């Protein structure tokens, strides 16, 4: 019996920021007066682009007030232009409490769509830049012993450029910024750049800007209290190709970008994905800890190394990572295994949910029960309701259920 996945319209994107669809404006080896202040970096990133144009709505939010999102992007550009004219460029920027920002800050079965599997595939790929330092992984108070060091270095080599790692660091930055603004600017509609930092294959430090968020009032007395925000994210993805994915968004067209491509220079429109969203103290605390995804992935790898190593009465770390009884690597290479474990862990973070919790526990139970049956038989009901009670509309849970059905047919 495969699981019954629900029927209904396709599921929609529900992450706090864009994943495979993000777009970066970047400055290499930055060295401007006041480098390392997000607002300064963001302005310098904005001014690397010359394709801006009069924005318009190209995919409206069917339940929101689309004029207000348009006005909010134009307000960002206007107020950033103001900062540019003040002699001393300030450190933070508190937006005027306009009607459009007041409205936007707040002052059902879905079927599995193909996009979430593509997101996951994109998360496993390598990028052309590194997102962590060599000793990023680990909190150890003492120097780690020799084998632990060797394993960390092999693993880091495999995942440092991974796209899932860019999501970790992106996620860590924006949650840190938003949590700190939530407490330092409680009453302000603070403009918060979405920034990440990486290093090129040639070693050039780069600062990247994905877009902006604007927080609402945030007198967060509890971990579960919510700060609303509006997010505004560049993308080269035309939302008209997969409209169902962008149900929660109003999408503007804001410029045109000249691109290197397999056909040479091409001009492509630049979009801006706009939605209203919210988070809480406790979720922002969790987002600041996303580097733990790296430790948890590493630890799953080390389990496998220790199992093979107990079988051989010998450490198998070199033999494992260099792919020297096992006669192959199902994913194709040791690197893809590491990055797949990572991508799984990061997507558990990015798409956390009660649905994911129930499915994770109740499917482990059904797994072990089906395992003991396949092993102890030839080919020839209640727990099933527990799992499928989590199969409602969440893309990550549905994708994992899809995967579970594949582990059944095999």
Ligand X SMILES: Brc1ccc(-n2ccnc2)cc1
> Between 47 and 201, whose beta carbon lies closer to ligand X?
47
Q: How far is the CB of 166 from ligand X (least distance, A)?
A: 24
Angular region, 138: left φ>0, alpha ψ -120 to 50, beta rest = left
Chain-centre distance of CA 44, in angstroms?
24
Kindly state the tokens that stand for 87. 């002699």
Q: How far is the CB of 139 from ligand X (least distance, A)?
A: 38
Closest CA relative to residue 355, chosen from 394, 404, 405: 394
Q: How far is the CB of 44 from ligand X (least distance, A)?
A: 8
> Between 46 and 293, whose beta carbon lies closer to ligand X?
46
Q: How far is the CB of 74 from ligand X (least distance, A)?
A: 8
Q: How far is the CB of 79 from ligand X (least distance, A)?
A: 8
- Roughly how many angstroms between the first and final C-alpha of the chain, as a whole number? 12
Q: How far is the CB of 84 from ligand X (least distance, A)?
A: 6
For 94, how many CA atoms within 13 A lie in the half-sphere containing its CB?
10
Break the chain down into helix, strand, coil percent, rounded to 5. Answer: 45, 20, 35
Q: How far is the CB of 30 from ligand X (least distance, A)?
A: 15
Element (H, E) at 11: none
Cβ contacts of residue 258 below 8 Å, gap of 6+? 51, 265, 266, 267
- CB crowding 274-286: b at 16 or more within 10 Å, else e: bbbbebbbebbeb
> Between 43 and 284, whose beta carbon lies closer to ligand X?
43
Which residues, listed in sequence order, are joined to residue 59 by a DSSP beta bridge? 251
Residue with tokens 């630049």: 270
Backbone angles phi, psi at 250, to 5 degrees: -105, 130
For 386, how many CA atoms within 13 A lie in the half-sphere containing its CB?
13
> Between 80 and 399, whose beta carbon lies closer to ligand X?
80
Q: Which residues bind ligand X (CB under 6 A)?
A: 43, 46-47, 52, 77, 80-81, 84
> Between 75 and 297, whose beta carbon lies closer to ligand X?
75
> Between 52 and 403, whose beta carbon lies closer to ligand X?
52
> Between 251 and 270, whose beta carbon lies closer to ligand X?
270
């Amino acid at each position: 019996r495969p699981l019954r996945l629900p029927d209904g319209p396709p599921c929609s994107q529900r992450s706090k920021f864009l994943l495979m669809d993000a777009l970066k404006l970047s400055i290499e080896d930055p060295s401007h007066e006041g480098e390392g202040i997000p607002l300064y970096d963001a302005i310098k990133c904005m001014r690397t682009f010359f394709g801006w144009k009069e924005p318009n709505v190209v995919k409206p939010h069917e339940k929101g007030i689309n004029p207000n999102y348009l006005l909010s992007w134009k307000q960002v550009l206007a107020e950033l232009q103001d900062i540019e004219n003040e002699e001393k460029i300030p450190r933070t920027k508190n937006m005027k409490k306009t009607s459009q920002l007041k409205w936007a800050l707040g002052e059902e079965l879905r079927s599995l769509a193909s996009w979430i599997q593509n997101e996951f595939n994109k998360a496993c790929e390598l990028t052309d830049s590194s997102w962590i330092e060599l000793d990023e992984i680990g909190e150890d108070a003492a120097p780690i012993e020799h084998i632990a060091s060797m394993r960390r270095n092999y693993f880091t080599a495999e995942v440092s450029h991974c796209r899932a790692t860019e999501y970790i660091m992106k996620g860590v930055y924006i949650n840190t910024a938003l949590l700190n603004a939530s407490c330092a600017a409680m009453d302000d509609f603070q403009l918060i750049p979405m920034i990440s930092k990486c290093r090129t294959k040639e070693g050039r430090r780069k600062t990247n800007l994905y877009g902006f968020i604007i927080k609402g009032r945030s007198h967060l007395r509890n971990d579960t209290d919510v700060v609303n925000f509006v997010s505004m994210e560049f993308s080269l993805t035309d939302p008209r190709l997969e409209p169902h994915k962008w149900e929660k968004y109003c999408v503007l067209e804001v410029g045109d970008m000249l691109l290197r491509s397999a056909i040479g220079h091409v001009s492509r429109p630049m979009f801006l994905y706009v939605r209203t969203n919210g988070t809480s103290k406790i979720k922002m605390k969790w987002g600041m800890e996303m580097r733990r995804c790296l430790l948890q992935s590493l630890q799953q790898i080390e389990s496998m190394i220790e199992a093979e190593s107990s079988v051989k009465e010998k450490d198998m770390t070199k033999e494992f990572f260099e792919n020297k009884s096992p006669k192959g690597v199902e994913e194709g290479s040791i690197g893809k295994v590491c990055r797949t474990l990572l991508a799984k862990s990061v997507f558990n973070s990015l798409y956390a949910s009660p649905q994911l919790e129930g499915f994770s526990a109740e499917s482990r139970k059904l797994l072990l029960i089906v395992q003991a049956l396949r092993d102890n038989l030839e080919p020839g009901g209640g727990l099933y309701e527990a799992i499928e009670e989590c199969l409602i509309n969440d893309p990550w849970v549905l994708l994992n259920a899809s995967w579970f059905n594949s582990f059944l047919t095999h």
